[PDB]
């Protein structure tokens, strides 16, 4: 049954065999049952490394394609794998994760994923296909961003997380430095203020993400 896979995927993770991990966590999800926090994290980490491996390869090839048809074909070979991985996730999202998501925390998280994996497609979207792809990303993010504003404290790690990622979207994909910085400062400056309440530990999860926000801002100015 299912408890075996989660144990089996964690093994793949220590074994740094991320494709097997994604494969297992794919099965735990295709069950139709809403995911456990533990289960979700494991799905997310699995596919982060499977897709991340291709993004790195891609950035590396594409930088060398600039500095020749051989370099291009290899880039396109990479992109096809990238696209598969992304659609695979997006289907699982639309078919299993998002409909089942109950709480706001879950529905935002899966929507931020949706934005994130559409963002990864936008990194390699060429020609005609790009416009359509960018849109489903921003719509995905935006919807999550709105629910988040309704349901979450300025220092909530998921909200802080959505802000960080969705800012990058502006800076990098939309090439809007202003919208992207404007958003990061919004999320960050709210946090510092609310940071009276925080328990030491919460403080840690928050300060961690807030540090990522400022890291980009630093980098962006």
């Amino acid at each position: 049954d299912k408890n075996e896979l989660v144990q089996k995927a964690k093994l793949a993770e220590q074994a740094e065999r991320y494709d097997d991990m994604a494969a297992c966590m794919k099965s735990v999800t295709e069950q139709g049952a809403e995911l456990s926090n533990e289960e979700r994290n494991l799905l997310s980490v699995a596919y982060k490394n499977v897709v991340g491996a291709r993004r790195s390869s891609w950035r590396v090839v594409s930088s060398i394609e600039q500095k020749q048809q051989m370099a291009r074909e290899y880039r396109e070979k990479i992109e096809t794998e990238l696209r598969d991985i992304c659609n695979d996730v997006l289907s699982l999202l639309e078919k299993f994760l998002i409909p089942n998501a109950s709480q706001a925390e879950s529905k935002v998280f899966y929507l931020k994923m949706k934005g994130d994996y559409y963002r990864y497609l936008a990194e390699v979207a060429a020609g005609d296909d790009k416009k359509g792809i960018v849109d489903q990303s921003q719509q995905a993010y935006q919807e999550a961003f709105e629910i988040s504003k309704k349901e979450m404290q300025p220092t909530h790690p998921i909200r802080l997380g959505l802000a960080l990622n969705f800012s990058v979207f502006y800076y990098e994909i939309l090439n809007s430095p202003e919208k992207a910085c404007s958003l990061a400062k919004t999320a960050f400056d709210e946090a510092i203020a609310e940071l009276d309440t925080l328990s030491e530990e919460s403080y840690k999860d928050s300060t961690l993400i807030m540090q990522l926000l400022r890291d980009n801002l630093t980098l962006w100015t």
């Binding site: 994290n41 925390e105 998280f109 994130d116 998921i158 997380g161 990622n165 990098e172 993400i209 980009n216």
Partner: peptide, 18 residues
């Protein structure tokens, strides 16, 4: 036996919940 220490881009985050 030395098992001891020696030897640029923008950040994005995945949120891993308790």
């Amino acid at each position: 036996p030395r098992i001891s220490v020696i030897s640029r881009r923008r950040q994005s985050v995945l949120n891993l919940m308790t």
